[PDB]
Amino acid sequence: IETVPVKLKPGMDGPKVKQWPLTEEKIKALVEICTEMEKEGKISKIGPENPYNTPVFAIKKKDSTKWRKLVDFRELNKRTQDFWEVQLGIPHPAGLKKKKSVTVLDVGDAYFSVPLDEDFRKYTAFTIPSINNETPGIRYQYNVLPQGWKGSPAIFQSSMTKILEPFKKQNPDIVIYQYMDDLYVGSDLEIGQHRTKIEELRQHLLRWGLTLWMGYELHPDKWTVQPIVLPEKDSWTVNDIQKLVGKLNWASQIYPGIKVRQLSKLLRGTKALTEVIPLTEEAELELAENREILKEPVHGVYYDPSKDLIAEIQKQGQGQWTYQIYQEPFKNLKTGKYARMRGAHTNDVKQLTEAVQKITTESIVIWGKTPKFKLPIQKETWETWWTEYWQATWIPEWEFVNTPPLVKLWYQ
Amino acid sequence: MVPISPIETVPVKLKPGMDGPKVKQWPLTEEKIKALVEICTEMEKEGKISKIGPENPYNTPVFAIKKKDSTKWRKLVDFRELNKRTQDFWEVQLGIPHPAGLKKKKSVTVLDVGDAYFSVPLDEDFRKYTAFTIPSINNETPGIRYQYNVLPQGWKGSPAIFQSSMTKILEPFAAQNPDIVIYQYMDDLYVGSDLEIGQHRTKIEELRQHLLRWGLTTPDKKHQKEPPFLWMGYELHPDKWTVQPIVLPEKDSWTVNDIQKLVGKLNWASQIYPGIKVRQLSKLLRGTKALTEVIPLTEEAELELAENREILKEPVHGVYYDPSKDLIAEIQKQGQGQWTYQIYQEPFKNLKTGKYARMRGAHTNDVKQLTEAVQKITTESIVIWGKTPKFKLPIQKETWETWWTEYWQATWIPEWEFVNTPPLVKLWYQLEKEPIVGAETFYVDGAANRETKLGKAGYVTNKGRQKVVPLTNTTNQKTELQAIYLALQDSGLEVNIVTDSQYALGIIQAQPDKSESELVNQIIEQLIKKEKVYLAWVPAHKGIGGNEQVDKLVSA
Ligand SMILES: NC[C@H](NC(=O)c1ccc(-c2ccc(C(F)(F)F)c(F)c2)[nH]1)c1nc(CO)cs1
Numbered sequence: 001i002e003t004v005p006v007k008l009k010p011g012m013d014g015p016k017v018k019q020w021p022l023t024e025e026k027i028k029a030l031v032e033i034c035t036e037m038e039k040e041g042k043i044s045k046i047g048p049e050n051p052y053n054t055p056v057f058a059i060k061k062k063d064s065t066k067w068r069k070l071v072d073f074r075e076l077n078k079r080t081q082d083f084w085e086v087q088l089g090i091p092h093p094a095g096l097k098k099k100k101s102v103t104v105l106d107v108g109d110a111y112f113s114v115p116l117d118e119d120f121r122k123y124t125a126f127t128i129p130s131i132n133n134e135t136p137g138i139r140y141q142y143n144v145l146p147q148g149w150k151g152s153p154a155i156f157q158s159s160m161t162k163i164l165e166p167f168k169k170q171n172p173d174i175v176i177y178q179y180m181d182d183l184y185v186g187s188d189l190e191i192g193q194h195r196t197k198i199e200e201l202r203q204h205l206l207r208w209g210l211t212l213w214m215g216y217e218l219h220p221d222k223w224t225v226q227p228i229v230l231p232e233k234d235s236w237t238v239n240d241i242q243k244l245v246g247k248l249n250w251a252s253q254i255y256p257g258i259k260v261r262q263l264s265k266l267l268r269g270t271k272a273l274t275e276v277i278p279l280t281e282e283a284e285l286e287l288a289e290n291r292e293i294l295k296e297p298v299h300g301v302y303y304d305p306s307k308d309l310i311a312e313i314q315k316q317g318q319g320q321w322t323y324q325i326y327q328e329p330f331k332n333l334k335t336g337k338y339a340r341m342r343g344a345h346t347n348d349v350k351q352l353t354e355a356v357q358k359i360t361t362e363s364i365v366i367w368g369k370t371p372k373f374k375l376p377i378q379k380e381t382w383e384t385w386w387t388e389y390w391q392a393t394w395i396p397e398w399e400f401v402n403t404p405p406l407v408k409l410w411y412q
Numbered sequence: 413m414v415p416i417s418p419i420e421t422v423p424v425k426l427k428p429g430m431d432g433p434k435v436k437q438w439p440l441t442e443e444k445i446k447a448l449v450e451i452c453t454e455m456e457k458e459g460k461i462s463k464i465g466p467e468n469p470y471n472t473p474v475f476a477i478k479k480k481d482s483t484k485w486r487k488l489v490d491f492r493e494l495n496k497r498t499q500d501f502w503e504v505q506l507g508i509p510h511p512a513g514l515k516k517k518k519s520v521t522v523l524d525v526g527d528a529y530f531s532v533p534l535d536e537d538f539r540k541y542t543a544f545t546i547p548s549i550n551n552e553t554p555g556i557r558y559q560y561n562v563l564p565q566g567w568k569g570s571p572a573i574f575q576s577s578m579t580k581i582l583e584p585f586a587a588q589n590p591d592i593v594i595y596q597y598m599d600d601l602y603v604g605s606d607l608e609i610g611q612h613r614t615k616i617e618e619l620r621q622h623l624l625r626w627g628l629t630t631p632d633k634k635h636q637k638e639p640p641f642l643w644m645g646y647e648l649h650p651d652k653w654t655v656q657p658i659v660l661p662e663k664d665s666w667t668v669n670d671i672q673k674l675v676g677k678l679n680w681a682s683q684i685y686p687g688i689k690v691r692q693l694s695k696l697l698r699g700t701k702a703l704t705e706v707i708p709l710t711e712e713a714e715l716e717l718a719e720n721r722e723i724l725k726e727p728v729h730g731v732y733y734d735p736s737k738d739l740i741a742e743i744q745k746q747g748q749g750q751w752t753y754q755i756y757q758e759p760f761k762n763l764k765t766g767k768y769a770r771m772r773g774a775h776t777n778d779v780k781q782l783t784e785a786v787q788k789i790t791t792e793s794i795v796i797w798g799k800t801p802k803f804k805l806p807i808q809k810e811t812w813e814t815w816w817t818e819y820w821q822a823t824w825i826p827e828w829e830f831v832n833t834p835p836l837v838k839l840w841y842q843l844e845k846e847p848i849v850g851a852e853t854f855y856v857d858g859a860a861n862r863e864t865k866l867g868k869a870g871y872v873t874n875k876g877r878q879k880v881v882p883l884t885n886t887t888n889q890k891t892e893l894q895a896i897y898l899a900l901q902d903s904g905l906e907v908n909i910v911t912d913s914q915y916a917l918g919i920i921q922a923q924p925d926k927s928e929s930e931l932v933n934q935i936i937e938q939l940i941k942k943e944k945v946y947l948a949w950v951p952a953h954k955g956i957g958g959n960e961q962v963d964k965l966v967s968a
Contacts, residue, residue, distance in 0.1 A: 018506065021791060024798030047422045048572035051500040125502075131798040132513035134595040136504040136579050239847045242910070242950050249951040260954060268957030270855050272874045273847035273908045273948065315822050348822035377822040378780070384787045385824060404820040404921040406914060406949065 092368030099186030108181025517604035803828035855958025858891025
């Protein structure tokens, strides 16, 4: 019931990020939520001698009609101590990504029972904004461990293992991983059976609240990395071979022995784009060898936990979005495609926002950290609207791509 | 005596790793010394300051400015060195309330509490750093030493500690008087209500007594203002608001000053006067950096100000906000990357107006600019009214649908409807997704010599048509564009174009409708004339006979 001593890194002041404007209904929701949190001692009002600030907003999570508060602790997380004192955080379970099913359980409400270092509380300051700068902003600071802070799972880590030491004692087949306010539970188990062991944990978490009700069902193994495909045709136009040669030349940056000599020789002469060309036997051979080259994975593609992960996203149209996760260019650690059943037939930014959340989820499962996104969207459009469709309690970093990349063709 | 409730003290520290101020007291004339001891004597016996001993090593200089007109002397402490050493405070001062956000209230009173900041106690542990010295006559005695017991003026933390304390005190009065509203900005208290003027001044009277409970004196017999009032460059009237009437300066050789005091002042007019344009006067600025340099007015400037000396002729007013009615925002394209907008709830009665200027960009189009302006008005509306307005846009629903479904970026504008007020935002060209059967295929290429800057651009087609043009003072990137221009210029209404220029693709795939480059603009004008254009890309130096038999033609 006592403090864990928490510092920042020397040479770094606390976060002083400005609160962005909020709709009237979001302010109202935050006032009601924070009034109850104040009554329960989780937060307390603060005076103007606290110069720190972290933005806050409010959303609605998946399949629920009640506002929830989210604090954008991204800046504070950068400035927070790294928690590898006696136990360096939580080593990532490489076995979680190879389980047939993984389910995500919100365990964040358990952080609200463990006090936070009274010396550190001043750094968690946030502001409920007023409309039109009419009233001053209502200022709070956290007394308990805050959701969205990277220190919260690190501090609760020791007290979380006792909570699961009975569960993983009974079920050594199950891999449980904690990231931020989420519990990731995976197993090689049958689908109906995997759901059964899960609320066994949910009931097992209520027993210790004496001294969190729905589930997201990921499937890591039912998914795989993605190869480069080449068309299979019986008649090729000039255009067809031109696109083929372009894709092969692009793939030759990733795979070494890719050759285009015999196919590009077919493109010599100034023929109509829609004219059919028979394939040279040497060209048919070259296309065949290129295919087998593309069936093996890239050689020497290694994950380096010392370097950032970068995620690129391309809008392909009709609700389809491609993406790649890499650390070095031309060295994809995962690629994928996300299409419909998103609810945004007419909203590009909702689809992109949901794509960002899913890619981050996959990235948390595989490596235990979030990637830096390169988003195909203007900064002004994204920063205006992404909080309208955000549902996760973590937030990644992102930059913006203003020049249309040629590679959208090759990943289509 | 009715007892006073103590105002809670805000703990204050100095910046980490910083001592206190130690500044010497400047030599004052004998008459000024006389005034300062007079002033400090009354405020000492008012409990505001107190003499300190020889212990306190900190010192802040103090001056006395005889006020103008009034034959009085008023005191001045220059806290600049102490402000540098004091901790940073929380910043509520982020914005200035906009008149169009105020709701229409029947009765509204405003009370200046420029008095009350001095009845607020200062943190005792911090008063030792407020020390100052009254220099004695002829410097023959030790200067009388003083320190502050309450929030000093000109001090860093005074405005934030004063407003924080005032908000604390106002909470239960507002909470238990929901039939009023109390806004608090700067040194003023805004109190509005929808009850009859009788019960208003009673609740005003009740508030002043509520503030007496903490020892904060309030203006009474008049001295508190009622609308209308001149405030922050606005004119707030009971039913309407407007900019302060503020009239353009006149010069024949216009300085930097001259329009730095005019676009900043034409920007002010644009928030209620519709259609104010500023561009042909701001180009005369960013291309200069001298705060006295003179610039003659360009030919399009005296045409634009002649319209700024034309909208500023009749008074136009804004209405206050009605939360029960919908918020409407309407946008008009003005030309040269200029956009004007009006926000209203009823026709003919704007809450406010405004403008948006394109971003500095190498290339652009109308849709991206309209999209950006929608985002600016969205954020401005959230700030002012707490909600997103419904938009009326000069773009057809099918134009927007084709745009966002085919644009390579993700894009979105909130709920909106088409308003048919030209000039309408349009898609000026649309590239084909597949090659065109029966259209001539132009294989284009260009190349330049980095040294001589001579180059060639041209094409070869499937019908045997060919052209190569010699060029001077050009780059590889320019010749690649010029090759495409030639093919567009020399082809029929439908044409397939094959290029290896990733530079050209990057420009055209971004779909500009206007450019800085005079060459890109020619290409755009040619695209607009076409019926179908399919632009294909192939990798260079693979000898793809189009981009080979014309690569061997443009480098020869
Ligand atoms: N600087 C002059 C000083 N104030 C004013 O005149 C003033 C007039 C109107 C507002 C005003 C309007 C709107 C807001 C809000 F933001 F709430 F919408 C607000 F906070 C204040 N202020 C005063 N001096 C005396 C003489 O003792 C009386 S008033």
